[PDB]
Every structure is written in structure tokens, then in C-alpha cells.
Assembly symmetry: C2
Homo-oligomer: 151 residues x 2
Amino acid sequence: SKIALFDQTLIASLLQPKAYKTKVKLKISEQRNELKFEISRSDDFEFLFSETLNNEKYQILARDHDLTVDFDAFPKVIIQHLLCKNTEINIILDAEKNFCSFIKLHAVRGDHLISHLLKICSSQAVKLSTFYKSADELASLRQKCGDLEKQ
Amino acid sequence: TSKIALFDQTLIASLLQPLSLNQPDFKAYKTKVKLKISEQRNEEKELKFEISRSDDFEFLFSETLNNEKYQILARDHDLTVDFDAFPKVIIQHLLCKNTEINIILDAEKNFCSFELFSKTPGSKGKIFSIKLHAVRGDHLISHLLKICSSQAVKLSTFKSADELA
């Protein structure tokens, strides 16, 4: 009930009235009524902005930026823009950090932010499953260094 | 702030919970649960119970008692002790080796019953039980971020075998 169309880490310019280039993960997906844009940062856990486009909402966005392209072919076109070297991504935040212009994205809070943070916690958890014998194995090799320092 | 910690420690608790929403029968295992009892003010005095688990990030239950809410709990568990003394009595029970903590979760993990049971002979046994609710929103966000930022300092201490050689 959610299909990823694009999921990748880009270099974006981040303005907030300071400006700095940062790595931003952009995820474009397709889902049922019941198109979604999600941006997040690996260096900032709380930073999370989204927007969900429906046919009606899209018609306004298509009028504003003079897009003749329909709702089904719009993600296909943006996906191709994201591939081009000449494409720039600029993200400008408001004073209250409630919104950001990428399309106007809103700050993701509550349950969606909880899902995001849990995914980080559980990914950072597999970090302890691989790295647990690290400090212990370092002793056997560091002892081998001093014993080989003589030769 | 107004919030004062009266008890903040890791205990061994018995955790009973249904196997799932479609299997009511219980599964039980002893686990390490961090219990925090704190005094605060909201408008008079309030007492807050918070439980969490280091092995389960989403596991976060609380309850805030006020004078009125406490009178019901005391009536229910036949506590003659007043609201100011109630945490003092709980803390003395938690000092005793014969004290048992039992946490029974519902199938949906929405609530849980936290029980303090004294195995000392002559005791009433069940000292009390308080119904704790699953913490969501901003408080859970603060909790989950603290874990993320704690697991982050894990990368600051981590040059990967110092280039092996």
C-alpha cells in the first residue's frame, strides 16, 4: 500500500533565516487514496519533512510551475530531473521550522516521527550486533605489535 | 525544574504479556526494567511512575497520580498511608530483597499493570498495583531521541582496528 519510486541521498543547499550544503535523503513513493515526498538527514534525527500530493493538490502545483505533464507522468519527469547533473536541490525552512520549501513540505511529528526515530534506533542496534568483539580483539593484535616492535 | 526524582534505578521485573492480539494466553520472562518515581507540580503535588527497557526502545509506560487519584488507589489496595508518605513506603519496599515487581501488559501494549509484591512473611503481600499507560507523542519522541543520541556517542568512541595493521 506504498511503492518507492525514488529513494536516494542528494547534496542540497539548506537555508534558514544560515546557508550550508548538507546530505539529504529524498524518498518519492506511490500509495493508495485511503504521491509522497519525504526528506530526512542522517546527521539530524529530528529533521523530517513531507508532503502528499493528490490529483486536486497536483493541479495547483502543475498550474504554479506550468507543468503540462499529468499526475501519473509527474514522478517520472521529476525522477529524470534528479538524474541530471544540472539539477539543484534547495531546501528553505521557516522561523518556527513548521514548513520547508523543496513543493511545500511540512514538519513530520507524532507517529510518523516516532516510526522514523525507531527505524534509526533499530538500525543503530544492528551496529552493536556486528561491533561487540571490536575492543576485545584489539588487545590480541596490539600485543602482537609490541612483540614485533623489537624486530 | 519542578520535577524531583525520588527513585531512579534498574530492577528485575517479571513480564507477563499475551502471545499476540489473536492469542490471549501468557508468556512470562524476567527482564531488567528502569523505574523512575518523581515528584512534580501541576495546576498541587503529583507523583509520576515511569518504566522503560534498555532492550526495547518503544517500551515506555507512565502514570501520574494526584491526591484524588491516589485516594482511589489507596482504597483499592487498603493503604492507610497518605499521599506524601506513599512514595516513601514504596521506596522502602523496593530496598528489600524479598520485594517482587510484576508487569502485566495487555495484548495491544496500550496499558500495563505494575505490581509491587512483598515476599516477607507477615506482609499483606500485594502492596499495590498501578495501571500505567503507553507513552506516545512528545515524551516518546524525547525518549527515542535520547537513545539515538546515546547510540551516536557510540560512533565518536569508534578508527576501525586503527587501519588493521
